[PDB]
């Protein structure tokens with residue numbers, strides 16, 4: 226068993242991870258559960274231990290993108306998840322409410338709070354086989370939207386109690402951030418569907434004007450796009466993220482350290498290099514220090530800017546290379562939410578791409 | 593040769609920066625009635641080689657309204673939490689103004705212990721033999737920090753608004769404490785509009801309009817005297833919007849120690865008590881307090897983790913130093929379900945609709961941010 230499929234998947238926002246779903250005592254897996262998607266790899270060791278091999282084939286996009294008719298793919302590890310143990314000592318009804326609000330992971334480990342600096346390390350192994358036109362994020366620092374923060378059809382942004390949000394959810398169903406009239410699904414004969422428990426299968430009817438906070442660009446992403454390796458930092462100071470504000474820097478086009486800005490957002494390419502110059506068939510180790518932008522919540526102001534530092538190290542052609550590729554740069558990075566940020570690595574295939582992706586990741590540490 | 597030096601400068605900590613000339617010993621501002629006798633630097637009652645602070649509320653010195661109908665209360669206190677001009681240096685131009693309207697100025701200042709963060713405190717009190725046994729006063733308290741854009745509509749919806757949305761509301765609603773009223777302009781006795789120093793209308797509360805905003809509530813921790821008892825009292829409120837009508841408050845007199853009086857959302861615990869007559873008089877009593885705050889789930893309104901209270905008491909009587917572990921590391925509910933945390937005050941807060949005179953000294957404050 227040179228490669229061992231790891232097919233267990235956790236909906237980290239809406240479910241606790243079972244102990245049997247946890248990988249190496251510190252990870253859970255998200256995205257498509259194909260056997261090939263994620264495998265423990267004993268043929269590509271790092272620091273004397275198995276690495277994780279991630280693979281998305283052409284047909285492996287399972288998710289919908291923002292664009293019309295666009296798709297995306299995901300096979301990732303999350304360092305943030307909650308377990309049964311995390312709910313001990315909370316009210317009995319806490320887990321159920323957490324499922325509905327999608328706040329389960331709020332109760333788990335691996336969250337860097339708002340405003341708290343943290344250092345991170347991880348290593349990546351890019352096969353020579355990897356296509357230069359891949360469109361994939363291989364490591365990202367993800368935010369945690371405020372789950373009872375809503376916008377009414379009339380345009381008022383407000384945060385509700387959990388109980389009030391549960392009331393709203395009786396007649397509104399949210400698809401991502403977008404509210405729709407809640408209805409029950411019919412079969413192809415026009416007869417109501419019942420689920421495994423005998424309940425109606427709820428479905429999104431017409432859009433009803435409601436919004437809830439959901440999604441948004443990741444504060445920090447390492448990836449490849451358009452024949453470029455890139456590191457991109459995003460900031461969003463708006464209390465309720467506006468998903469229609471598509472402030473996103475292009476690795477291809479946007480010059481290094483020249484932020485693309487809207488009223489509320491900023492998107493900075495902190496570093497880039499041609500794909501051809503990225504070392505292949507060797508472990509590349511990144512050491513990342515992050516000082517998050519701080520925000521004023523309902524005031525929507527940036528209190529203090531952030532900072533990013535990145536060192537890159539690898540051994541290639543009988544030479545060890547160490548490059549200070551992000552040299553302690555003042556940068557806007559984070560999201561205006563209550564909760565902070567969590568680390569993921571693997572494959573997140575974006576930009577409406579089905580170009581195959583396969584590489585390995587290992588050696589993660591945060592402190 | 594100084595004896596007593598009046599400190600009459602007062603700061604509206606929630607709605608104003610403290611001027612440099614209002615700051616006492618580089619670390620305090622004063623709140624409450626500004627009578628000369630209310631607060632004085634006292635060179636006749638030294639503590640650790642330094643002047644203490646003498647606080648005094650006479651019978652006529654209640655200047656505040658209590659919750660109860662026709663009830664009054666009094667205040668002369670120091671706050672360790674306040675904002676200064678320096679705190680707003682380099683901020684957006686309109687930041688201070690919005691902070692004044694929302695009553696969030698002190699959010700930008702020093703002396704805040706964040707939600708969930710443990711902290712140690714120390715202070716000393718000197719109770720004269722003259723102090724009447726039926727005083728009703730809090731001499732040290734740990735105060736919370738309400739969410740200032742958290743409102744309730746006339747229809748009963750609890751919601752937190754953006755600052756901009758709250759500013760819009762504030763155009764036509766004026767809040768008196770937590771209670772919203774139609775905003776109107778005040779007239780003189782002839783029925784002619786008053787103009788302020790800059791020629792603007794003087795705003796006034798008209799009829800109640802159904803709106804509420806978060807304000808007030810019991811202090812998370814209070815040291816005081818009531819009904820002939822010295823007491824330490826811990827309060828917890830897990831409701832997202834504090835309900836002021838929920839009068840969950842323990843009395844030292846009859847409530848047994850460490851047995852909370854509870855509502856659905858609140859708890860009030862007498863952590864310790866002793867008869868007034870047994871409290872040492874005419875000497876400095878030093879308290880060392882360690883606090884672990886209860887943590888709360890914000891809009892979920894649950895208690896995440898309980899808190900803890902430890903209190904040591906030390907003084908010298910006629911013959912020996914006495915040290916008593918009066919609150920021995922007690923698991924306890926203590927805090928408030930708000931975004932912001934807690935700040936220290938000491939002095940006189942005369943509660944329970946009392947006008948019994950109060951005079952004592954306080955000194956020797958330290959918080960070790962640990």
Ligand SMILES: [Ca+2]
Nearest residue numbers: 464465561562
């Ligand atoms: Ca947000």
Ligand SMILES: [Ca+2]
Nearest residue numbers: 832833929930
């Ligand atoms: Ca509150």
